[PDB]
């Protein structure tokens, strides 16, 4: 979630969000509406948690002004679907379905994977934007990259698990290719020959 | 003219520290802006030092004018010289 615009430069300080399988960045208001919360007041309710802080509201104002052009969920999803790096010429309904797929899955997968569970995704998006604003308004120091409680160590277990995942996927693809070749001959394969 | 008003509150302590006069700032604004903006300024004795302005949908235009004014109004000094220090030099004569 990038925060474009330098201090006293670049006019408005818009907040654009990078999304997977999307060729160009997207303002936070449009994706927020795409998730299914249109009113701007509720977007501010999700993002901010204390109404008296006028500075963060002022910093969110350019994003609201930029996103005012979009006002409906479906047009927001369509706008997501045009830039989704898919094959050119896809129809509008299929574009909207592709946007729904790329929004439900692959957008914060660690939260959830099922349909109609995007409320938690909206709350987490508000949390991320709140953290970005808190750091941008000099209220907190930037995160320590070298902090050791934010690091993890991979022992023999995880390394061998990643290696075995790659090798097993290769073996499964080989089994698939051999099965496709064998179905041409139409024989009751022993299945002890496909496995290498 | 327009109903929109633009007044800015300036810190008295740092304005006196830089040894500046309100009339000087008013003349600088008048020179850079000709008669496009009407300007008034509170006197020295005021409790809070203020200087207003009035233009002669224009809220965003006034916002851009205020941002431009804050950005590039040079009161005095050589541009590029951010800070100046006084130093004592031991010289053999």
């Amino acid at each position: 979630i990038k925060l474009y615009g330098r201090e006293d430069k670049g006019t408005g300080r818009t907040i654009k969000a990078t999304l997977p399988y999307v060729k160009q960045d997207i303002p936070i208001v449009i994706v927020f509406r795409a998730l299914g919360v249109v009113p701007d007041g509720e977007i501010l309710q999700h993002i901010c948690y204390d109404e008296n802080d006028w500075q963060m509201l002022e910093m969110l104002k350019p994003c609201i002004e930029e996103g005012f052009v979009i006002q409906d969920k479906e047009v927001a999803l369509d706008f997501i679907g045009r830039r989704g790096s898919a094959a050119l010429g896809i129809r509008r309904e299929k574009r909207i379905q592709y946007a729904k797929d790329i929004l439900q899955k692959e957008l914060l997968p660690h939260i959830t994977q099922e349909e109609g569970f995007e409320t938690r995704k909206t709350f987490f998006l508000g949390y991320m934007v709140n953290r970005l604003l808190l750091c941008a308004l000099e209220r907190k120091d930037q995160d320590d990259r070298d902090h050791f409680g934010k690091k993890r160590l991979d022992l023999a277990g995880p390394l061998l698990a990643n290696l075995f995942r790659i090798l097993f996927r290769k073996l499964t693809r080989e089994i698939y290719r051999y099965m496709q070749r064998c179905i041409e001959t139409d024989r009751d394969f022993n299945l002890n020959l496909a496995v290498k | 003219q327009s109903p929109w008003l633009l007044r800015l509150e300036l810190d008295r302590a740092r304005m006196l520290d830089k040894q500046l006069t309100m009339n000087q700032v008013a003349d600088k604004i008048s020179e850079v802006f000709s008669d496009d903006l009407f300007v008034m300024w509170s006197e020295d004795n005021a409790d809070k030092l203020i200087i207003r302005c009035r233009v002669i949908e224009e809220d965003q235009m006034l916002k851009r004018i205020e941002a431009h004014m804050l950005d590039l109004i040079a009161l005095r000094g050589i541009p590029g010289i951010s800070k100046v220090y006084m130093v004592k030099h031991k010289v053999s004569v």
Partner: protein
């Protein structure tokens, strides 16, 4: 009660090293891997599917295979003459062998049709020494000496070639 001296702290540290040892993280990670991770990786994508809408009387045929349980064994050595025997790390070190064990997977095949399977060997996984799946885990001090293994050796490594 009574106060706790520095000697009590060293007693507690001795208890720690008596329970854990110095290479416990390696062995615990490898044991977790062998015990659960292989099965979970196999069950990540448990279904290969092939379909064929044959028209040559429309018969929509789906061919699919399921992956079942993972079976592991103790490491074994297969000779050129065809015989097999249990392998130990000293022999693998001396003869430049790999200390590894076979892995077996249950594949179940079904033949779906609409008109409108035993243990397969999938490979050999190298075994970490002194882990739960190593032959030296059980051996006591005397048989460890008979197997030409040093009792001060701690394990936590693999023997490849």
């Amino acid at each position: 009660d009574d106060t706790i001296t520095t000697e009590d702290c060293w007693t507690v540290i001795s208890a720690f090293f008596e329970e854990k040892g110095l290479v416990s993280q390696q062995l615990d990670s490898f044991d977790e891997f062998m015990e659960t991770s292989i099965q979970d990786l196999v069950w990540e994508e448990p279904r290969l599917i092939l379909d064929q809408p044959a028209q040559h009387d429309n018969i929509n045929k789906r061919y699919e295979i399921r992956f079942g349980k993972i079976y592991l064994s103790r490491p074994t050595m297969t000779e050129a003459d065809g015989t097999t025997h249990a392998m130990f790390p000293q022999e693998a070190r001396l003869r430049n062998l790999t200390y590894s064990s076979p892995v077996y997977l249950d594949m179940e095949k079904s033949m779906f049709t609409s008109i409108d399977g035993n243990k397969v060997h999938i490979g050999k996984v190298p075994i970490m020494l002194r882990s739960k799946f190593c032959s030296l885990r059980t051996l006591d001090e005397v048989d460890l000496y008979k197997m030409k293994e040093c009792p001060y050796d701690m394990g936590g490594y693999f023997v490849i070639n």
